[PDB]
Design a protein around this ligand. Structure first.
Ligand SMILES: *[C@@H]1O[C@H](CO)[C@@H](O[C@@H]2O[C@H](CO)[C@@H](O)[C@H](O)[C@H]2NC(C)=O)[C@H](O)[C@H]1NC(C)=O
Ligand SMILES: *[C@@H]1O[C@H](CO)[C@@H](O[C@@H]2O[C@H](CO)[C@@H](O)[C@H](O)[C@H]2NC(C)=O)[C@H](O)[C@H]1NC(C)=O
Ligand SMILES: [Ca+2]
Ligand SMILES: [Ca+2]
Lengths: 236, 237
């Protein structure tokens, strides 16, 4: 791929809703402002942005949402969280248990309860898009939850295995699906539509010179963290 | 309303998706970062943030969306634009024509076209929330469009008049509705729910000792631009 380098060093990156955010190995938190990854207050090991807001988790697995000028702590524990769904929150905890929060609950603040929904299965990484969520388990097996909607965040309730192996996976607001495998190779799912949410094939792509670490996609731009923590921007 | 004053001066403010943005009298563009309004690049006369993204318009009525590190120009002309709907964009042009953009179009990039849908009618201000949009016309009359959805952004197609007079109006991600009238009074719509999207009445409240100019609400915090451009950050009681 034809990609440009952009200054910075990260371990994780997420793009969504026109925003791009990430964290470095020190767990410092960054937002892309006028083409500069800009440090903001916060300690997070994973930071996500999309239609559901700006959501992250820290080393203690506490959950944070940027609101009204700064991070506020939500109730619950997750090791990874994603905000790419249709105003829903999704993620996994330290036991690979899988949770989502429906739109109406996400948008209620202050709240007297945080009504997490547990999904049936085990995943180590989980990401949502417009009509589905995708994740991978501890054996790098890939799964899709179909029929996900804003107030039925758990979708059909039954995960479907998609052949292949990936270590992480992200779903974009246009429905695009990208992931990186344990060997540091980068893949895109082809043939993904609302009518065929599972898509058809995995295609190989190269953005990094010596291996890929993390990937996210938004609005025609593929974002990579390479193995050395450096960043690539690939306008597709 | 229990308020603090946040340093700065704005003419317009919008809050949504946990973000707070706005523009000043000079059309400098701001985002609230770590409790400080921070200038970003851009000349905009209205800047909105919500589940549909970060959308603004400039003095020439060109439309801009923040994506991938900076503003990109979309097709079309609007004098006001809102991103509070469910991944839909809505707004009005200089002739008070009313438009919306469906979710699937909003999320498509590259796009050699921005396929705006025109709603029948005239409004000078239009704002969207989770299941409806509200607007006001040039005579300050108030309207709701119900059962707006991500890929039917035009909703029922039948604007319903809600008695009262307002100069602008905003709809929050939790469905809350607030507005400011021509005299600088501030109102909330009471009784708004999914079962009753039109609500029941208007209630007056004051955040600005010197009168109100603009309002937006998100996640339990009401944001005011006062008549003098000062900024109040409030919680409800
Ligand atoms: C940044 O966050 C990571 C992930 O939480 C921290 O690394 C973990 O630290 C805990 C102890 O606090 C250990 O139980 C884990 O084994 C560590 N995981 C990994 C992958 O290293 C890391 O220490 C944090 N760094 C800073 C500077 O805050
Ligand atoms: C900021 O934008 C406003 C709104 O476009 C500008 O005020 C308008 O200026 C135009 C000329 O470009 C006039 O035709 C309008 O009558 C003005 N409208 C209002 C409401 O005053 C304003 O000049 C801009 N300021 C800067 C520094 O860019
Ligand atoms: Ca994501
Ligand atoms: Ca708004």
């Amino acid at each position: 791929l034809d990609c440009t380098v952009i200054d910075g060093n990260l371990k994780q990156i997420d793009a969504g809703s026109g925003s791009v955010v990430g964290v470095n190995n020190l767990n410092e938190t960054f937002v892309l402002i006028d083409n500069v990854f800009t440090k903001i207050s916060g300690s997070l090991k994973h930071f996500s942005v999309g239609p559901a807001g700006q959501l992250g988790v820290n080393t203690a697995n506490n959950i944070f949402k940027y609101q009204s000028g700064g991070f506020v702590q939500l109730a619950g524990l997750l090791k990874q969280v994603d905000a790419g769904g249709d105003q829903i929150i999704a993620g996994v905890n330290m036991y690979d248990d899988i949770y989502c929060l429906n739109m109406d609950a996400n948008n209620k603040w202050p709240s007297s309860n945080t009504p997490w929904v547990q999904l049936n299965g085990k995943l180590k990484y989980y990401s949502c898009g417009p009509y589905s969520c995708w994740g991978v388990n501890s054996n790098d097996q890939i799964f899709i939850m179909k029929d996900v909607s804003s107030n039925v965040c758990s979708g059909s309730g039954s995960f479907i295995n998609i052949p292949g192996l990936l270590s992480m996976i992200e779903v974009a607001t246009d429905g695009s699906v990208f992931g990186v495998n344990s060997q540091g190779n980068l893949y895109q799912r082809t043939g993904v539509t609302r009518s065929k949410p599972d898509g058809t094939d995995w295609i190989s792509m190269v953005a990094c010179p010596n291996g890929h670490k993390h990937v996210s996609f938004d609005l025609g731009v593929l974002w990579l963290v390479c193995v050395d923590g450096s960043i690539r921007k690939c306008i597709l």
